[PDB]
From Swiss-Prot, chain A:
GO terms for biological process: translation. It comes from Bacillus subtilis (strain 168). Part of the 50S ribosomal subunit. Keywords: Ribonucleoprotein, Ribosomal protein, RNA-binding, rRNA-binding, tRNA-binding. This is Large ribosomal subunit protein uL16. The gene is rplP.
Curated annotation (Swiss-Prot), chain B:
Changing R11A: No longer associates with 50S subunit. Synthetic growth defect with ssrA deletion. One of its GO terms (biological process) is rescue of stalled ribosome. It holds the Pfam family S4. GO terms for cellular component: RQC complex. SMART domains: S4. Residues 1-62 form the S4 RNA-binding domain. Disruption phenotype: Not essential; synthetic growth defects can be seen in double rqcP-ssrA mutants. Double rqcH-rqcP deletion strains grow normally in rich media. Loss of Ala tailing, RqcH is still recruited to the 50S ribosomal subunit. In vivo mild decrease in tRNA(Ala)-binding by RqcH. Keywords: Protein biosynthesis, RNA-binding, rRNA-binding, tRNA-binding. Associates with stalled 50S ribosomal subunits. Binds to RqcH, 23S rRNA and the P-site tRNA. Does not require RqcH for association with 50S subunits. Crystallized 50S subunits are variously associated with an A/P-site tRNA with or without RqcH, as well as with P- and E-site tRNAs but no RqcH. Displaced from the 50S subunit by puromycin but not thiostrepton. This is RQC P-site tRNA stabilizing factor. Changing R2A: Synthetic growth defect with ssrA deletion, no longer associates with 50S ribosomal subunit. The gene is rqcP.
From Swiss-Prot, chain C:
Belongs to the universal ribosomal protein uL18 family. One of its GO terms (molecular function) is 5S rRNA binding. This is one of the proteins that bind and probably mediate the attachment of the 5S RNA into the large ribosomal subunit, where it forms part of the central protuberance. Required for correct processing of both the 5' and 3' ends of 5S rRNA precursor, which is does in conjunction with ribonuclease M5 (RNase M5, rnmV). Possibly folds the 5S rRNA precursor into the correct conformation, thus acting as a chaperone. HAMAP family: Ribosomal_uL18_B. One of its GO terms (biological process) is rRNA processing. One of its GO terms (cellular component) is cytosolic large ribosomal subunit. This is Large ribosomal subunit protein uL18. Part of the 50S ribosomal subunit. Part of the 5S rRNA/L5/L18/L25 subcomplex. Contacts the 23S rRNA and 5S rRNA. Required for catalysis of RNase M5. SUPFAM superfamilies: Translational machinery components. Keywords: Chaperone, Ribonucleoprotein, Ribosomal protein, RNA-binding, rRNA processing, rRNA-binding.
UniProtKB/Swiss-Prot annotation, chain G:
PROSITE patterns: RIBOSOMAL_L5. One of its GO terms (molecular function) is rRNA binding. Keywords: Ribonucleoprotein, Ribosomal protein, RNA-binding, rRNA-binding, tRNA-binding. Pfam families: Ribosomal_L5, Ribosomal_L5_C. Belongs to the universal ribosomal protein uL5 family. Part of the 50S ribosomal subunit. Part of the 5S rRNA/L5/L18/L25 subcomplex. Contacts the 5S rRNA and the P site tRNA. Forms a bridge to the 30S subunit in the 70S ribosome. Interacts with VmlR. In stalled ribosomes contacts MutS2. This is Large ribosomal subunit protein uL5.
RNA sequence: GGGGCCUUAGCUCAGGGAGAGCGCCUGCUCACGCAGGAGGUCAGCGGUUCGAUCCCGCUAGGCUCCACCA
RNA sequence: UGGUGGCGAUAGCGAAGAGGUCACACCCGUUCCCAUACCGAACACGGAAGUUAAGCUCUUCAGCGCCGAUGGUAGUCGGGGGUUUCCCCCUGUGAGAGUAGGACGCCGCCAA
RNA sequence: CUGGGGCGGUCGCCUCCUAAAAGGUAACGGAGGCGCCCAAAGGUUCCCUCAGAAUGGUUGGAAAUCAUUCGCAGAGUGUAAA
């Protein structure tokens, strides 16, 4: 459950996930990676689920290199409450994702193993994905 | 302030319980009048006290609650002893 | 180790600090000064056009003397430039102590020009 | 404390000016010079 | 039903209508202001003056022109006919 | 060494200069103010009570010679060290300031005229067979009630010599003649010591040439012991 | 005396050793700075002045009281508090202090076994410490209020530590 | 759930550069009194300041008060 | 050469070299003007024995920094469409970044 | 005023974001400040240039005050922010 240690503002606007990514569109730390085909917010619980999933499938395998970090916080008012009276309290932390963006990489491991692990992770994630490799 | 609190903060009596007890016995007095633990006190007060036969007369200069140990005795002055 | 700054560069900073407040025009030009260890030079300028009008120096072959570097020389060159700006009848100027003091040779020169007719 | 003040002339007797000051840093009856528009001059003014 | 509150972030200052007030190539009278600001986003130039509020005004009549102090620094000026 | 440490209050001269502190405390610096570079004219016993006096000289801040009276009262739990003026008898310094809230005879605080404790009605040196009724029994108690310098240790060890005025007079002559033997006694632990040797008990004895070395080999040790035991319990 | 020794013997020896083209390349003693850190004067200002007196006596020059550049809570000092004093000796006074230092005061250092040739700053300047001010005879034990020390910095126009130490060894500076 | 107050020695609790009393240890003194030492995150986090019990904000706990009209 | 101004460091940083009889600095002493929180270092005052080291000028270079295209792309006014937390099509516009490359200076006035 | 009212909270001014590249622009939207201070913390003249680093080192230490090179600015600008 990743966390930014320190932040300026505990409360931010949400934003808009228009367009494609700026960077991180291609694997370069590792060999076999995964990228997105949509745009969405992703949570520390999602990423750690995917991470531990692939690492359990691999059991010693090489290196991973996540390519993101949930910097963004997201609020949520308490339950059964009218509107207004200030912005809701923070709940967790979020990473924002554009399409064309690489999320997880892999090295030290064969292609079939990598593809299967990333499949497993994709099923923990909400969005549509693609298997990718380095050029 | 109250007499029992005052006695404790001035460290004349080591326990507020004892101050209450002796004031309920009425062994003491203020300005020649018999008094009680709830009796009010102030600067310029003249206090008469007993410890068995040991009779003591003292004068009030100040009052406070935080009362660190040596500063407690600045709160008042001994005048006299009798028996 | 040690390191040492060029007092000329310092003088340039002080000169610029001055220059921020003024500039020489027609009918109110700028009178600028230079103070070599062995010479003293003076010029009169329309800073608008970036043009000198008159000039003077110990180096001038007229009135060659021994000091070229004391207050006497400063006075002589001051009166010289004054009559230059008289025959180009401007008679009204502004002074530019170029990061120097209005204390010594500079002061003497300026006083010379004041006496010769130039009005600051 | 920071407190208001009037600053009266001495030839004219007129008040003519106001300001403020610390009583701590400037306790004494302060004085300055200002223009008296009746005496038509710079002139020492005094606090009241 | 529940009960909540205490936003304590509910104010802001009055908007002060900064920016330029006259345009390049525009004729201007004496004393007209040109660019309200705070500090110097822009400096004065010829026949232009700065005030205690860092505001820029024309000392004369003329036409306005904005330029640059060499690099990364701007300027205004009034040039008459 | 001087000590007003209640159970260990004493005076001593030690080959073991233990440790001069890094901090000069208030009392130390006040002594430096008025005694440093001093001159120990005379010592006095305060009339055989457990009290001592140093008559000291020293030049003041203008080179004019001045004097003072340093007093060391070793009473037990309420020992103290005091400094006093010679002629004025005014206290100048004090280690244990003591306010008259204890309704006591004397007082410690500086500026005040110094005063000594109430000396009890005891003949400080047969007279016991005169005054005291030897039928009373447990007279090791009540020799304190007749003499000034007494320990119950000394009283018991002398009473066990069995009418015994002889023991008292002989031991007083011994002390007056400085005829004692500085040893440490150990009665199954509980290590005791005194001028005289042990008189009767089973305890071991180790003798010395100097009472000062006796004191040496015999404020914070007990604190360390408290800490050690508190830790040992937990362990 | 030592300025003439510099101009007449030190400059030839250094020019010959380092193969300098110009005499202006020969390293010069630019200044001597003597400092006392008297951080114990936050409690007593009269301790600052008496250390200031010793410095005046040693250097022959009224010293500049230095003060805290910023507040430092570990040492209990606020910004602007006066906790040192220094003199900057130049020209004749510097050469005379340098002679008094080499020929008189350094021989009176207790158990003097030489000065450290390590104490160059990497640029050619030499710093040393003096533990007791009593090595200077202009100081009397009766006058002394507390055992003061000081530091002495010799700032030189040398480009390296090699050049600076050669300049100092040319005066017979007592390097071990 | 909201608002306020508080969280400091083992307990009770006072208070921009750590205190008291109670209880432990010790001597004095059977049983109290009297003199010392111990035990300290100033609830936690973050911030301001040279410097935080102290000033600021957030969080955890406790307590008190409110939590309503249909 | 020196002085003095103008133009966005295409002027600068950095490395390597060359020169100073004139000139400019560097250099040498405080008796005076004046000065140094301490100071003849600097500022002032006077001087010219020696110094091209350094400063200053003249050459070189593209290591740093600086400037900077074309094309392409994102974005986008406008129009239109669609499975519309977004996406797509069309006329038009059009960056940044990354390149190609440019550049270790251009222009003036005075004095010898 | 009030995403019914009540209770809570707020009520004027300044700074920023939201704010959509002039200006302006709301919400019980997000962050913070003011109800002053300086008789020099003002005016003018003249002067010079910071923060840190390393590195030197008697005290003195992580951390004084000292000296050196690096150092467009990391400091400062009475106070909040721009």
């Amino acid at each position: 459950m990743l966390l930014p240690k320190r932040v300026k503002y505990r409360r931010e606007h949400r934003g808009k996930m228009r367009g494609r990514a700026k960077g991180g569109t291609e694997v370069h730390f590792g060999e076999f990676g995964i990228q997105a085909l949509e745009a969405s917010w992703i949570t520390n619980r999602q990423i750690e689920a995917a991470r531990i999933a692939m690492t359990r499938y691999m059991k010693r395998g090489g290196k991973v290199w996540i390519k993101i970090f949930p910097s963004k916080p997201y609020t949520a008012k308490p339950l059964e409450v009218r509107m207004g009276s200030g912005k809701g309290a923070p709940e967790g932390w979020v990473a924002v994702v554009k399409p064309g963006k690489v999320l997880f990489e892999i090295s030290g491991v064969s292609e079939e193993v990598a593809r299967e692990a990333l499949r497993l992770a994709s099923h923990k994630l909400p969005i549509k994905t693609k298997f990718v490799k380095r050029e | 302030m109250r007499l029992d609190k005052f006695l404790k903060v001035s460290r004349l009596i080591k326990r507020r319980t004892l101050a209450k007890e002796v004031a309920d016995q009425g062994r003491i007095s203020i300005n020649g009048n018999q008094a009680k633990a709830s009796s009010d006190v102030k600067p310029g007060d003249e206090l008469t006290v007993r410890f068995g036969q040991k009779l003591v007369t003292v004068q009030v200069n100040e009052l406070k609650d935080t009362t660190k140990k040596e500063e407690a005795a600045n709160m008042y002055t001994i005048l006299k002893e009798e028996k | 180790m040690i390191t040492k700054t060029s007092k000329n560069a310092a003088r340039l900073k002080r000169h610029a600090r001055v220059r921020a407040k003024l500039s020489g025009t027609a009918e109110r030009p700028r009178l600028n000064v230079f103070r070599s260890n062995k010479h003293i030079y003076a010029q009169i300028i329309d800073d608008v056009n970036g043009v000198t009008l008159a000039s003077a120096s110990t180096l001038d072959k007229d009135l060659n003397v021994e000091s070229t570097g004391d207050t006497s020389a400063a006075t002589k060159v001051g009166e010289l430039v004054a009559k230059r700006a008289a025959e180009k009848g401007i008679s009204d100027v502004v002074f530019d102590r170029g990061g120097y003091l209005y204390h010594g040779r500079v002061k003497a020169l300026a006083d010379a020009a004041r006496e010769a007719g130039l009005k600051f | 404390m920071r407190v208001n003040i009037t600053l009266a002339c001495t030839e004219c007797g007129e008040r003519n000016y106001i300001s403020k000051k610390n009583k701590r840093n400037n306790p004494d009856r302060v004085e300055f010079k200002k223009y008296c528009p009746r005496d038509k001059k710079s002139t020492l003014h005094r606090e009241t | 039903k529940k009960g909540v509150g205490s936003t304590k972030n509910g104010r802001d200052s009055e908007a002060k209508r900064l920016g330029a007030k006259r345009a390049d190539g525009q004729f201007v009278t004496g004393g007209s202001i040109l660019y309200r600001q705070r500090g110097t986003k822009i400096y004065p130039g010829e026949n232009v003056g700065r005030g205690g509020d860092d505001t820029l005004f024309a000392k004369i009549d003329g036409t306005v022109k904005f330029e640059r102090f060499g690099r990364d620094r701007k300027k205004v000026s009034v040039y008459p006919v | 060494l001087l000590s007003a440490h209640p159970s260990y209050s004493r005076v001593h001269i030690t080959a073991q200069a233990y440790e001069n502190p890094s901090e000069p405390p208030m009392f130390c610096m006040l002594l430096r103010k008025h005694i440093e570079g001093g001159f120990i004219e005379k010592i006095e016993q305060a009339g055989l009570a457990a009290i001592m006096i140093f008559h000291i000289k020293s030049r003041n801040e203008i080179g004019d010679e001045t004097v003072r009276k340093l007093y060391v009262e070793i009473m037990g739990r309420h020992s103290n060290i005091i400094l006093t003026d010679a002629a004025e008898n005014v206290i100048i310094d004090g280690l244990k300031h003591l306010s008259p809230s204890m309704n006591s005879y004397r007082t410690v605080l500086p500026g005040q005229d110094y005063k000594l404790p109430p000396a009890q009605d005891k003949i400080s040196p047969d007279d016991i067979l005169r005054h005291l009724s030897f039928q009373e029994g447990r007279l090791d108690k009540q020799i304190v009630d007749h003499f000034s310098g007494v320990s119950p240790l000394f009283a018991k060890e002398a009473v066990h010599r069995a009418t015994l005025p002889k023991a008292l007079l002989a031991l007083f002559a011994e002390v007056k003649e400085h005829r004692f033997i500085p040893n440490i006694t150990t009665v199954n632990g509980k290590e005791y010591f005194y001028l005289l040797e042990l008189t009767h008990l089973k305890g071991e004895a180790r003798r010395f040439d100097s009472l000062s070395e006796l004191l040496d080999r015999f404020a914070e040790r007990d604190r360390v012991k408290q800490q050690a035991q508190d830790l040992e319990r937990f362990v | 005396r030592l300025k003439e020794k510099y101009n007449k013997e030190i400059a030839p020896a250094l020019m010959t050793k380092f193969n300098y083209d110009s005499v202006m390349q020969v390293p010069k003693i630019e200044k001597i700075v003597i400092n006392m850190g008297v951080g114990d004067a936050v409690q007593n200002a009269k301790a600052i002045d008496s250390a200031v007196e010793e410095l005046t006596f040693i250097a022959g020059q009224k010293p500049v009281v230095t003060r805290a550049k910023k507040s430092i809570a570990g040492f209990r000092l606020r910004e602007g508090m006066p906790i040192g004093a220094k003199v900057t000796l130049r020209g004749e006074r510097m050469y005379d202090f340098l002679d008094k230092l080499i020929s008189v005061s350094l021989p009176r250092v207790r158990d003097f076994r030489g000065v450290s040739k390590k104490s160059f700053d990497g640029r050619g300047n030499y710093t040393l410490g003096i533990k007791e001010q009593l090595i200077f005879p202009e100081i009397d034990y009766d006058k002394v209020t507390k055992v003061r020390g000081m530091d002495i910095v010799i700032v030189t126009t040398a480009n390296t530590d090699e050049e600076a130490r050669e300049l100092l060894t040319q005066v017979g500076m007592p390097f071990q």
